[PDB]
Subunit: 152 residues, 4 copies
């Protein structure tokens, strides 16, 4: 079982059912855990970025998906949580690379910027693409951890 926590802001609430489906489409082993808003009313993205990011950081779920207007705010807020590597992706290539290079554990998307079929492709690619495990990538990821440690 590979659990995937999902969070959104208000505009992306309209596609939260989409996001749940797209996670399931990546494979039977992928289990969506919806942690976003329950209504379409205005919320603050950092509150939902934080909820999902903490779950990833505490090893409660393997992955996170954050969808908002542009995804920029989501990516900034999520990355403030130690242990999180949150990747704002806009296409298949970035989705794949975020995993291959960065062993990213959260994918961020913009509902106002990226069409839903490309969001679908991003989520499936993100979840299916394995980390390369190559020496230089492992070293660089360790250096990110070291930046975290220096500010804790």
């Amino acid at each position: 079982t590979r659990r995937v926590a999902i969070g959104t802001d208000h505009p992306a609430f309209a596609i939260h059912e989409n996001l749940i489906l797209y996670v399931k489409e990546a494979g039977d082993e992928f289990v969506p855990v919806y942690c976003g808003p329950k209504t379409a009313e205005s919320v603050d993205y950092p509150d939902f970025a934080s909820r999902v990011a903490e779950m990833v950081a505490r090893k409660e779920v393997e992955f996170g998906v954050l969808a908002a207007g542009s995804g920029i705010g989501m990516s900034i807020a999520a990355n403030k949580v130690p242990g999180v590597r949150a990747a704002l992706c806009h296409d298949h290539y970035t989705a794949a690379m975020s995993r291959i290079h960065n062993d990213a554990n959260i994918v961020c998307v913009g509902e106002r910027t990226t069409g839903v079929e490309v969001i679908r492709e991003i989520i499936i690619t993100f979840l299916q693409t394995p980390f390369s495990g190559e020496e230089r990538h492992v070293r660089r990821i360790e250096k990110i951890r070291a930046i975290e440690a220096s500010h804790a």
Copy 2:
């Protein structure tokens, strides 16, 4: 009264570091590029250069940062680990503008292997020229980002 802009790259993006310096200058005479990336084409680790630029922004030695790498993903992750930094991975004009309007972003990240140089130019100029809205909800959300930082400090 000019505005300083720190620039960092990884190894592949070093090939366009002169581009990045020019694009900052093209945003206006008030923008002063401060190049802090690799001086050669030798292999480097992006977090080292992300940290260098991010720390300069956080300490207020410069107003803005520009980070260019393969995808920009690693740069955005690493830079955001520094308290006070709001680093935005941008791929077009719209994201460049909205990073400023909504997030008051202080670092722009781009991917040299993903985004063509003329779009990188547009992103940098738009990022530097676009002011923060100052609207109530955006101020509140940015403060909530600061609160997340403090909880892990």
Copy 3:
């Protein structure tokens, strides 16, 4: 008065009211003329590409906007009409360049690929950006006409 004919396929019908608004947002002089489907039922994109493209080619309207799934089919079909220069755009830069370089008269977008706020930006930029009128661009546009003539 600068008239702008609008056409869509079935999925993009959901945003046809958006497209009408975005044209108006470009300026008071821009007048949308909606020529797309009236319902959400399945249609064939070439039928609507052709309708809008013929209007542009016959100088009935100055510009066209075509929105579909990816915009690829729209761009291919519209360009089959002599006098049409249809540009599939995915961002501000392509929207602007299509006008500056190519004096494009139809903009094509994908509703499944490009978020609506970026579609808005594309349409406004397309309509507001003037053609450069530079020697080399005028020459290249004439060469496109010559390709048309050689197959007529």
Copy 4:
């Protein structure tokens, strides 16, 4: 039984013409690149090279075409003026795949100034490897494109 792929560029994209040849080869041993772009960096008009490649596709001398220029917009407009050509301006994996699945596209167009080289690589490989669906509605729509051509012939 191999599949020929004609390649054309304008002047700026000439800098990556060797890239384009390699990327076609990377799609599989069955794909044979046929370079028909400029042999030098001298200034050229894109419609001349769009026409060259488009005519080769239309006459069935090759199966596919690849056109790379500044934005790719001019290439896509010019190539589509040739009867029998379905030229797709692509900016990512999704558009590359859907151009084949839905439109049975026979020419892929890219912008060197807009799209990074690794995404251009992905686009070319995806375009060549992805088969046409052959589904009833797509066949009908492609036939309607042919009908538009005939009405202006």
